[PDB]
Amino acid sequence: AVVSTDEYVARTNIYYHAGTSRLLAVGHPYFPIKKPNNNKILVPKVSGLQYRVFRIHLPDPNKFGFPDTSFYNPDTQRLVWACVGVEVGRGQPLGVGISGHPLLNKLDDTENASAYAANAGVDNRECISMDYKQTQLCLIGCKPPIGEHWGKGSPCTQVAVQPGDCPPLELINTVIQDGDMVDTGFGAMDFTTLQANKSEVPLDICTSICKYPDYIKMVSEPYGDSLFFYLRREQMFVRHLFNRAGTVGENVPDDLYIKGSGSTANLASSNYFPTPSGSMVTSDAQIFNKPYWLQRAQGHNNGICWGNQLFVTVVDTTRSTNMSLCAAISTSETTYKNTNFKEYLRHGEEYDLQFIFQLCKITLTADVMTYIHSMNSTILEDWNEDPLKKYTFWEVNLKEKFSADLDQFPLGRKFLLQLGL
Amino acid sequence: AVVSTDEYVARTNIYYHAGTSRLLAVGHPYFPIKKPNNNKILVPKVSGLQYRVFRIHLPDPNKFGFPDTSFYNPDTQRLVWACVGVEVGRGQPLGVGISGHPLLNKLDDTENASAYAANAGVDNRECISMDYKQTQLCLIGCKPPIGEHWGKGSPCTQVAVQPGDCPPLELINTVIQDGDMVDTGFGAMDFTTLQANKSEVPLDICTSICKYPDYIKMVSEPYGDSLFFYLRREQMFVRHLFNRAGTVGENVPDDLYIKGSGSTANLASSNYFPTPSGSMVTSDAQIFNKPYWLQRAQGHNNGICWGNQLFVTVVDTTRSTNMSLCAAISTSETTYKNTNFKEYLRHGEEYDLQFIFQLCKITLTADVMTYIHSMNSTILEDWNEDPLKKYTFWEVNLKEKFSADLDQFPLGRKFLLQLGL
Amino acid sequence: AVVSTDEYVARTNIYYHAGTSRLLAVGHPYFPIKKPNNNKILVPKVSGLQYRVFRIHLPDPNKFGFPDTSFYNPDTQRLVWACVGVEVGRGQPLGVGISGHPLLNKLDDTENASAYAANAGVDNRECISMDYKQTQLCLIGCKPPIGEHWGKGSPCTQVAVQPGDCPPLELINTVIQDGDMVDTGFGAMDFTTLQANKSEVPLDICTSICKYPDYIKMVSEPYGDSLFFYLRREQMFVRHLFNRAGTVGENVPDDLYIKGSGSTANLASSNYFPTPSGSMVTSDAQIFNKPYWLQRAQGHNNGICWGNQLFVTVVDTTRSTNMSLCAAISTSETTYKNTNFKEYLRHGEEYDLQFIFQLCKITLTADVMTYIHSMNSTILEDWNEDPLKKYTFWEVNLKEKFSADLDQFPLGRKFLLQLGL
Amino acid sequence: AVVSTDEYVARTNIYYHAGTSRLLAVGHPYFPIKKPNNNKILVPKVSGLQYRVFRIHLPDPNKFGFPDTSFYNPDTQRLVWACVGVEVGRGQPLGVGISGHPLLNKLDDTENASAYAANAGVDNRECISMDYKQTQLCLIGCKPPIGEHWGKGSPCTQVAVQPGDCPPLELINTVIQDGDMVDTGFGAMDFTTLQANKSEVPLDICTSICKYPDYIKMVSEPYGDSLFFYLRREQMFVRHLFNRAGTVGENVPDDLYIKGSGSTANLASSNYFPTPSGSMVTSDAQIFNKPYWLQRAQGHNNGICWGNQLFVTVVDTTRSTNMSLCAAISTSETTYKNTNFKEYLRHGEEYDLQFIFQLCKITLTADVMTYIHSMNSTILEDWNEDPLKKYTFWEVNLKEKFSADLDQFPLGRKFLLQLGL
């Protein structure tokens, strides 16, 4: 049986504040800029539609140098940091981005037509953009976040997949890495392995995987380390209703309609797809720049940062403004020439993480050691190399950022005032 | 006279948690894919616009093996499960689907016209899609849910129905089965038997029946077993205003207008029909992933699961995103060709049902037996074959899912915290 | 260590009211009107999209002439004014402005296209306008406000910047001056040094810098003098989705799409940019014409107006109505002639600042003098020339506006009623 | 010094109810219909966009005949009516009007253009209408309401105004009169004297002055008689973005753009103007048909109706529906002919004012007489001709409408129930 951390974790009266200075990220909104002949990334892909997963490193409270050490017995017990307050600061002005594809697979406008559309020739793709669905979310835990998305399942050993056959689906759980893309209105799926077309969605998710937090799985988790707090806010509506060019993969059963003739003799593509639109963005609806007090967790792990680690996942599309900047090739002629200006696109993201940590002590009794051992053996082994080297996240080092004077910080002041004593 | 179950059903202090692992449904959004020559379903129709009716099977508390059995007398009484808490977990990201018809009966755009429309020739149908009306609902009871819809009533034995004559309507009560369709903006009617046209609405409801819960009837129900709790949320607005091609079934009385001339000599179809649109979908408006505490029922049956059965009906169009996946027939040519790619459509649904059950006891006195016998004789017969074999629902077996440690589950923790003791 | 002003600043019982008569500003909405041959400004640029930074001058409480002076010892202590109440009155009717450019860089409409767009020739610029994003904000402190914006960073000494090369970005902190522009939907950046084009955005921000308050930095500020109170309200949504003419600065990696042919042979500009739109403006959402009681500040400076100064920064786009007024060149002909009328544009802004100040005393002990000295040496030096002469703000002199009869003023009545005694 | 009326005005226990029967106003929405040769008004201009200023006449409580007169000494004191409750009843169904101009100065659509607009010829005016900005407001006081608007200021005696020169602006305070127009989305200005064009705005405000309540001034007012209570609700958004035909009054500084060529050689009008739109009207947002309890005024005059007068200003555009009614010239031909029907426009407004008055007494001591004398000498002079004969307003006589039985009226019952005793 699993038990609340309040059972075996003792709460001291010491609190520390810690914070990143001000994280900054600048890059291209749709894809990374690199040397053609090369593969080294010259400019990274930075979009408001990516997940930001921060791997927060905390100084080991056991190795730490406190002014007083009488509050506990380093022989019978050990120390762990407990996250009690978080403030995810965001810094650019609110705004909405926009993503498209120069060759998006869009046959005709099916929202309203005055006459039957022509006939699909070869390549009827159009240069089309859209404003993605709005999403605001923040996940906090001591384990990396887990997402779900649809990918190409493994086929059953029988009927030989005929080329062009529809690929099988399979919900795939994955670790949400920093830089991954958020569902933008086309659901959470692996577009690379599920759309050979390469033109079904805008460039920025075109050959990526849009993942969605698997909230159900993470909360089901027995110990609840992956996430002990979260805030989610997503909205979306249908801006346009389109048709997909290509060839019928699956024909419309004729018991569903009466054959046409002349123009309506040939059925138009009934492979419709809508264009998303996350409406207006607003201050009143902001989730960030507000402190979160992680006092009572719904999981058994009540904010204990085992491993002196802490994960903060964020997605904020309410500041997705992309800015176009163009430089003149020549500063002579007083006559505009599209030829004389090179147009580019860049997007900037501004973060500022702040935390309030409460020192905790664990008397290493037998039972406790048995439990903690089962739960996560590494805990004890580390007490008196990176297990997730495969994954990549925004590394954040706070070992030199802890301060006992909450007084001197904004999150700290808020905390004292909030907790009174 | 009927009486509250609180009268004859005793509440014990035992509570169990039960939950489905994670139900998953993948299929085509508009129609089932099957072998043309055959009739076996290869891929099922799975749309966010269908009703999901779960038939929950519970272990017979009388046959069940409790650690302690002193809490009741198996001689004078019997045991029944009472539903006290439900959590309908949903798992895909929020999003809106879209449905159409390659040959929708849409003459002209009547929302605004600059000149009198031409003249209906033969087949003026257009390839048109729309975003259905938004609907979120959840019905819980120990009897299957009942719906209403308009169908073709039986004609009066007189005036012989001239071919093409308008068919008579009749509100028809039916049992809502898993897979049925929800009103999408065209009301709750049987389109197959009321629209020979086969082109008045999109393919997905085109030859189906859109049913609406008959809330009035169910609540009037004397014992109130069909539904002891519900949540409904529906919204819709007019996106477009169209005309219907075809021939006047009923002419416009000439006392309602002044005859035209030339172009306006012939009256245009005044058989208007609007295109629905369930606006934006939002987190804040979610009905699911929230626990429902069924403490006081408005009906006489206060959540007692007679027959160790339990029905959970759901409709959620806030995650109706359909994903198009296309496979290339050839991976050679570096030049797009519509024909090289087979386009398809698939839609996935993710559920996770969780419940908290309270054991109850009934002392089988004379009066009690008379009452329960009148109410539903099978109750007693079963105490010391499927009556709804005709109907089909998502069968859910929980006989091996009950657990006394609410502590170990999310809905369980919530329940304990909520009910304090 | 920094400490709250409540520590060393004593609160007296004297309160004074002070207010501007009624500030008025009239000018051209997009640019200043001046003599061509000259440079003197004939008509200034006055837009609802500019920041209004008021430099409030207060009478030195030490030089002031109070009826009674027994309340303190002019030998051991000094006096400072503390801001306790503010009312930013606004006076024109609510309404929305509009800004554009006669030669805006807008290739084609990418929101929905029926056929592949033509081909960029020379200068495809269009005369386009838009309604900027709505913004309401009010910053108050005893130091000028600080903003952030993206500008052209300094290049690394290596690869000689090829002409037309994309310029490097750099977040630049600046002092927000009166007349500066607010992000309007294109983010906070320096369009002059980042867009050689001179046609990427409307005229009014076209050769300016749109700055955003750097709330993060100001609140981190140790003493918190720059801002001890603020209100922000911003909203925006995508009205249109466009394309940018010009030449590819950075090409679309070919691994993101399948080469086209014929018309789709050449990739259309995928340098998309959206048109902003701050929706409807409303009374219910007003921030102004409401009193703000600055009782508990989140910073250490609790509204103390060191230097007898006070800064009030405002931005209100909910009254951005521009009014066109045209004069006839001739009052004869009774036939309209566009040539007979000269069309112009003017915008008016109306303010009315009101404050409630509380007198305070500081006993100049050793420690106090050491602290205040470290904090801002000028404090003491001035006690028993302008350091921001470089910057420009709406100068407001209140030295002759203080009144001890709060009773006689609207903000004063409100204050008494609010604070009871 | 000014003092609250609570200081010198004594409150009795007598309360009277008074109300208009049901005021009704019918006329043409845009302009008055009169005899061409004549000047007499045959049909007045009645629009939902006009201010309604009611001059309420109350019976002199001193001349009044009360059943009992022991409650006061007619020798030492005098009597005044105090307004304690108001109910502005409105009676037509909610709806939105619409106003246009057959020759509105609208060059081209600048919201989105596919090619550079042609060239302004002679008179490019279009027949255009719009739905004005929504406004609901109610001002009450014992003095007429005061408004502000921009008009043509007096020129400086220097540079001789060249014909066509832009006219100088000047905020002008005026008395708001019954029938005056409300800002409709083009701000509060005098279009007659600021727009020679006569085609910048719809007919209904085209040669009128749109005034806005000068709330700032009125509340600053020392005694606060002009308004001791108010409710304002206004909203507006940009429907369309247009261009103004005419000739450049002020040219676009060339440092703001790069000269074009060919078509873009000549700059298109950058004198943009938006089309307003007060969105949807709703019951939930109604301000009227609700009682207002004027118990505590923010001004010093707490609802005392000096001069036995009372002003109720109202503006309600939530019932601006105009109804078109056309009569046939001939009732013969069964063929429609536009020439056979004369089309007209009419708009109706329905009011019903109700008040609850509290009798008050003032002992005429020395000090009191000095104060009241300074405040408004006429008070005393009238005690034991019209000063605003020049202005106009809906005259309302209530001298015969006072009733001591509040019980018998709806506002009366509400009052009793609200005030308990």
UniProtKB/TrEMBL annotation, chains A, B, C, D:
Transmembrane segments: none
GO terms classed as biological process: endocytosis involved in viral entry into host cell; virion attachment to host cell
GO MF terms, alphabetically ordered: structural molecule activity
Cellular localisation: Virion; Host nucleus
Coiled coil: none
Residues spanning the signal sequence: none
Pfam families tied to this protein: Late_protein_L1
Domain of life: Viruses
Keyword Disulfide bond in annotation: yes
Cellular component terms per the entry's GO annotation: host cell nucleus; T=7 icosahedral viral capsid
InterPro entries in the cross-refs: Capsid_L1_Papillomavir, Capsid_L1_sf_Papillomavir, dsDNA_vir_gr_I_capsid
Keywords assigned by UniProt, alphabetized: Capsid protein, Disulfide bond, Host nucleus, Host-virus interaction, Late protein, T=7 icosahedral capsid protein, Viral attachment to host cell, Viral penetration into host cytoplasm, Virion, Virus endocytosis by host, Virus entry into host cell
Keyword rRNA-binding tagged: no
Family: Belongs to the papillomaviridae L1 protein family.
HAMAP family: PPV_L1
Reported function: Forms an icosahedral capsid with a T=7 symmetry and a 50 nm diameter. The capsid is composed of 72 pentamers linked to each other by disulfide bonds and associated with L2 proteins. Binds to heparan sulfate proteoglycans on cell surface of basal layer keratinocytes to provide initial virion attachment. This binding mediates a conformational change in the virus capsid that facilitates efficient infection. The virion enters the host cell via endocytosis. During virus trafficking, L1 protein dissociates from the viral DNA and the genomic DNA is released to the host nucleus.
Subunit structure: Self-assembles into homopentamers. The capsid has an icosahedral symmetry and consists of 72 capsomers, with each capsomer being a pentamer of L1. Interacts with the minor capsid protein L2; this interaction is necessary for viral genome encapsidation. Interacts with protein E2; this interaction enhances E2-dependent replication and transcription activation.
UniProt name for this protein: Major capsid protein L1
Record organism: Human papillomavirus type 16
Gene: L1
